[PDB]
Design a protein around this nucleic acid. Structure first.
Ligand code: MG
Ligand code: MG
Ligand code: MG
Ligand code: MG
Ligand code: MG
Ligand code: MG
Ligand code: MG
Ligand code: MG
Ligand code: MG
Ligand code: MG
Ligand code: MG
Ligand code: MG
Ligand code: MG
Ligand code: MG
Ligand code: MG
Ligand code: MG
Ligand code: MG
Ligand code: MG
Ligand code: MG
Lengths: 145, 206, 262
RNA sequence: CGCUACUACCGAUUGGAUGGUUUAGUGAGGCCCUCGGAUCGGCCCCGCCGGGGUGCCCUGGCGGAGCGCUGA
RNA sequence: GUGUUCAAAGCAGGCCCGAGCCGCCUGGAUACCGCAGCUAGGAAUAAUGGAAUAGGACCGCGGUUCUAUUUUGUUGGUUUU
RNA sequence: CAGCCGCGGUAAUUCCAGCUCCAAUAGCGUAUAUUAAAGUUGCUGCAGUUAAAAAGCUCGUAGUUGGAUCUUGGGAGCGGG
RNA sequence: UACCUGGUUGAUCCUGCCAGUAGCAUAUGCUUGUCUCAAAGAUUAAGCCAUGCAUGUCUAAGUACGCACGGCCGGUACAGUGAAACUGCGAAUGGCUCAUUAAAUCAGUUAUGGUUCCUUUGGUCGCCACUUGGAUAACUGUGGUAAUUCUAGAGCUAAUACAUGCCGACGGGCGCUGACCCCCUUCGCGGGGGGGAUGCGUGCAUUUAUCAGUGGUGACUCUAGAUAACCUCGGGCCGAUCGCACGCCCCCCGUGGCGGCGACGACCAUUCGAACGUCUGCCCUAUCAACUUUCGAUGGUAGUCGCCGUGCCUACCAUGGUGACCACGGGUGACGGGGAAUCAGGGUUCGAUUCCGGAGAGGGAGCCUGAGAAACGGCUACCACAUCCAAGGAAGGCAGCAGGCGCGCAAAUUACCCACUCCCGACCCGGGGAGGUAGUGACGAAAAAUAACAAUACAGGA
RNA sequence: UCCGUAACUUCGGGAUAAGGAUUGGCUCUAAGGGCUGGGUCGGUCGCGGCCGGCGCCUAGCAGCCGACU
């Protein structure tokens, strides 16, 4: 789509600017240096958990996960847990041993079935050779009568 | 768009014919690719079926075949010398199918040395003993000697091919479609086909 | 025009589905499948109109997604699945096990077989070829691909499938003196003995079939289908045995049997 | 021949009005190739730090730099 | 073909029966579809062809050539039937 | 008034009205295209002395149309009056 | 039912026309009680449109820190419903109209041994691995402009989104190098042979060149095989992938798997098709007799582009191709066909109109995404028209359902429902002015009311 | 230079009708010609001088020259 915009250069003919200060010298403006919001939510995948607390893939991850307290909800200050993705568990490992043991099959099959090759076709070749005897006979009738 | 349709032309009787429908999308062309020589640069194209073509635009290396003895190798394309279809493409150095070129000769030299053990390319005294004397060894005589001696009445290379090696670079032809593929493949000239194109080049000089 | 179709009208339809003109505007449009569109029988038609279990189509949906019906072993929950020919339709809850074979007039009648004999089927060969590594291959007419035939199997020949893992058994050839059944044209749903193959290089080949009662007709070879080793079919057959008794004969039969057959 | 009514014909005016097919110039925009490189990142070039081992580098905390090859 | 209350239409419908039959019988035909195109039979009618500066046939017979595997067991090469 | 022929100029079977009758009947008139009648566009199937109509006469390419003639019987296996 | 009547004259017989006669389809005039079916802005303007609807979608199985409910159970991450947002699929079907268009579309008929194909079905599926990186939505909060389905800056957070990149496997097997060694023979040479360290490569599909000739055809430069190299480069492919329930077997004291699904992938075949070709067939006009061609007309040779074959395009050559058996040019109240009316037999006329195919979305042109579009209820420009406006700028396409203006001889309700038929989707659950259902309706078609009866009389009759 | 050109006519013309485009420097390509040799093998003497049949570029080669468009 076609749309109108203004360039990057600044002059008088504006209405509003957006400015981001990068460091504070000394004075601490009250509107922007006394109060502070906390980061509303925490991480959710294991790798950023271990990045934060420096846990190093020796000890678990479940015990070191942030809990959200239920302030102002009404009555009960419950507390909740996010869910973790990219985690190792009995299910993902069960899935993996299925596929891989089934993917050593599909080549152990087709090899169990190469047994069927050797069996099915490579006996039927071995069966049609005891035949062809009508043929080598029927062209012996050509050759040497 | 750039179309390829055959309803914009005249009939067999030279009678006009009118556009009973407009441009479609399945009847297209695109701009030509006109591959030249230099460092590799390829652009990729999406086409009917969701498949791919590859516009090559600049190529230097190719796979070429000395077919008498069936050895393919990878070499650097030097220059373009003749083209039957048109005579401007040589001035601008475009690679299309059945263009005649010049290439390096060192790989085919090296294989021949390693195979028949003989000095391909007569140099007076400049080339006889840096390493071809080091090539000439018969460490297990009487076991490979009969072999390499049997690989003796099987070389008999032509006079004209020798002159090319002795120069440094030799003729070839192209057999692929680069704006469709992205490759330069081809073969070496030999025999009467070689005679033919030599005559054309030399006459062009006049 | 600018894409493929999704609907089908109702007076556009095949003639053997027997659709009522003054009932609606559309017909079920068999979905994509191994059998053609004209020579098939979708699941709704076999089940709502013939058997008359259900009286709507929504009812058919309510029964298919219970996983009772199953086509030729492998269950199918796509209500618009295109049934074929010589196939098997096994509910097996109440032991039905249908077979889906033509009548004499070409209408895909119902044919009940036993619990046994519902565990195989027969298939015509369409082509053969060898893939990679010299591994032969074989394609039937119902889009079912099978490696490693016996090398004494050629095109337009019949095989008996055990229906669990493919596993061909009991094959037969194309030759004079063996039964045949028709699948197209005008002599549909008739049986006979082949007796000849007149062939033309560059066109369609032809057979001159003869029925036992005396009739002798001819077809294109592609509409042919083989079921017997000579007077001996390997399957249960329907009422009529592929005859096409003429209109005057039916007139005697029914009138004479009318108010005397009861 | 004279009066009366109607239809068509020629007719100066380089007549006029609708359409349509095209020549020659100017030629919006999209697409292709050749360039261009606001901007946003790393191996880093080093200097300030550690852990690990063996004085070595691989990973986690500090500042600059050829605007190199990429990555866009 | 079928008493839709007849008909126009439409493809349905009918049976025994305490109603038990937890069901039974059924139907959803057939024809026409000019002209070109395909397939097999018949050969009157209409058009064309064949031997005239001669040609068909005869283990036909000589002979100048290539000569593929048949025999030369496997072999090296030639004529070899 | 009247599709056409025609009615009305002091006794109107035709105008304006009333009695009476006729035809179709929940339908009937009016206008305009279009079929049959049309053997008045004619292959089936017209006409061409005088009613409309055969070039002033002759030659001539494409087109259309073209003489006679080449195996007939007598038999054979049969079924009737 | 293969049919006729009046009129030229003072009378007759003939040519010959004018008028009557029966149907059918559009309009109007007069009239009207029942009931079953039932067409309807085509003809003139493919002229213009206010207002309102017609395309969206969640399973046991892609992402769940909504805190909106309240499970339950604690805190070993997450029972469970679950708005919004991200992801994948559909929006190219359907519906509407007939302006164009004259061997063109189209009907039958045959070919792709000259090509593409989402989905379905079946086959094959040989030190991120006991699991790597950062990226933004939903959310929190500061705002602009009068203006819209306009958006920015700041702080966090996920994947089957976007990237990255292992293990497994036998020196097992194959081929050409071959150090070395041996046997027999040779006076040696010759020969006649064996084992053999170290090497390089070693597939599915790609590109090319050569060699011999498992399976098939009327028809192979086919399918398969062998050798040398290449990667169509990291904007080449596959070797190799994430989720849900049921519960587990273990020479066993933690491993190897199988069982049962879903999703995706590289190649082959099928299925839905699509698109380029072959043979034959069309209305009127000669006051339309020559036409086409170095501004490709007709062939050849080489290539580019193209999913493939082809003057489809480019260079170099040749001078050809059509025509009285009607080319060429022009007209059509010309979309085509299955078919409709009339009809002794033969014919004449209509066919926009519910089925198939084609074309188009105000007139023209060019494109993105996608398997598929030169889309139009997708984008961008010029022309003609046209709505807001704070005068700076923004938004548009009823030949879709109802409705309106104009136009004219001439053509219905801003109604109810997804219950039937079918379609779409992540789906037994959601949507559908496609579709059904009532309303106006003497276009038209079928049945059928508006009196029956017995005495009183006689006009009279047998 | 390349296209395109009416009325009217004593059919000769009108016609340079009217009306449009292009026009440089430099680097390249293609086409357009001439003369000479082909009588060579043996016989024969001093590169040449006589003889019988050969191959004749018999589908046009090689060599050397030259100005213009
Ligand atoms: Mg008429
Ligand atoms: Mg008649
Ligand atoms: Mg007449
Ligand atoms: Mg007659
Ligand atoms: Mg006369
Ligand atoms: Mg005759
Ligand atoms: Mg008179
Ligand atoms: Mg009349
Ligand atoms: Mg029209
Ligand atoms: Mg039509
Ligand atoms: Mg369109
Ligand atoms: Mg409009
Ligand atoms: Mg468009
Ligand atoms: Mg649309
Ligand atoms: Mg619209
Ligand atoms: Mg409307
Ligand atoms: Mg009306
Ligand atoms: Mg009626
Ligand atoms: Mg003048």
């Amino acid at each position: 789509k076609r749309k109108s915009v203004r360039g990057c250069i600044v002059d008088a003919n504006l209405s509003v600017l957006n400015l981001v200060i990068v460091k504070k010298g000394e004075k601490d403006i009250p509107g922007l240096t006394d109060t502070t919001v906390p980061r509303r939510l925490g991480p959710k995948r294991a790798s950023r958990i271990r990045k934060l607390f420096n846990l190093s893939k020796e000890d678990d991850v479940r015990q070191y996960v942030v809990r959200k307290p239920l302030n102002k909800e009404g009555k009960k200050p419950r507390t909740k847990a996010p869910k973790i993705q990219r985690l190792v568990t009995p299910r993902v490992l069960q899935h993996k041993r299925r596929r891989i043991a089934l993917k050593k099959q599909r080549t152990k099959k087709n090899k169990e079935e190469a047994a069927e090759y050797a069996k099915l076709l490579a006996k039927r070749m071995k069966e049609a050779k005891e035949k062809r005897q009508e043929q080598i006979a029927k062209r012996r009738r050509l050759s040497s009568l | 768009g750039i179309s390829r349709d055959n309803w914009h032309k005249r009939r067999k009787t030279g009678g006009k014919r009118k556009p009973y429908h407009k441009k479609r999308k399945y009847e297209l062309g695109r701009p030509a690719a006109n591959t030249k020589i230099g460092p590799r640069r390829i652009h990729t194209v999406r086409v009917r079926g969701g498949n791919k073509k590859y516009r090559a635009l600049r190529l230097d290396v190719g796979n070429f075949s000395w077919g008498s003895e069936c050895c393919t190798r990878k070499t650097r394309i030097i220059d373009v010398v003749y083209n039957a279809s048109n005579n401007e493409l040589v001035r601008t150095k475009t690679l299309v199918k059945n263009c005649i070129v010049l290439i390096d000769s060192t790989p085919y030299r090296q294989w021949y040395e390693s195979h028949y053990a003989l000095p391909l390319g007569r140099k007076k005294g400049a080339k006889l003993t840096p390493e071809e004397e080091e090539i000439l060894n018969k460490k297990r005589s009487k076991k490979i000697q009969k072999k390499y001696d049997e690989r003796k009445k099987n070389a008999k290379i032509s006079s004209l091919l020798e002159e090319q090696f002795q120069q440094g670079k030799l003729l070839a032809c192209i057999a692929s479609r680069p704006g469709q593929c992205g490759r330069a493949d081809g073969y070496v000239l030999e025999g009467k086909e070689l005679e033919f194109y030599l005559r054309k080049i030399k006459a062009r000089k006049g | 025009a600018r894409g493929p179709k999704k609907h089908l009208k109702r007076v556009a339809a095949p003639k053997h589905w027997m659709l009522d003109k003054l009932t609606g505007v559309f017909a079920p449009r068999p979905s994509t499948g191994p059998h053609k569109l004209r020579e098939c029988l979708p699941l709704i038609i076999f089940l709502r109109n013939k058997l008359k279990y259900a009286l709507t189509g929504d009812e058919v949906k309510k029964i298919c997604m219970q996983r009772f019906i199953k086509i030729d072993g492998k269950v199918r929950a796509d209500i618009t699945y295109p049934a074929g020919f010589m196939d098997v339709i096994s509910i097996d809850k109440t032991g039905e096990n249908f077979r889906l074979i033509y009548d004499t007039k070409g209408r895909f009648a119902v044919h009940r077989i036993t619990p046994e004999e519902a565990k195989y089927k027969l298939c015509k060969v369409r082509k053969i070829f060898v893939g990679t590594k010299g591994i032969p291959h074989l394609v039937t007419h119902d889009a079912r691909t099978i490696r490693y035939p016996d090398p004494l199997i050629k095109m337009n020949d019949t095989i008996q499938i055990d229906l669990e893992t493919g596993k061909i058994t009991d094959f037969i050839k194309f030759d004079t003196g063996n039964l045949c059944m028709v699948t197209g044209g005008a002599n549909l749903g008739r049986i006979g003995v082949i007796t000849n193959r007149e062939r033309h290089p560059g066109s369609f080949d032809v057979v001159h079939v003869k029925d036992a009662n005396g009739n002798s007709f001819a077809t294109r070879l592609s509409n042919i289908f083989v079921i017997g080793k000579g007077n001996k079919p390997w399957i249960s057959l329907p009422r009529g045995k592929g005859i096409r008794l003429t209109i005057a004969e039916e007139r005697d039969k029914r009138l004479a049997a009318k108010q005397s057959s009861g």
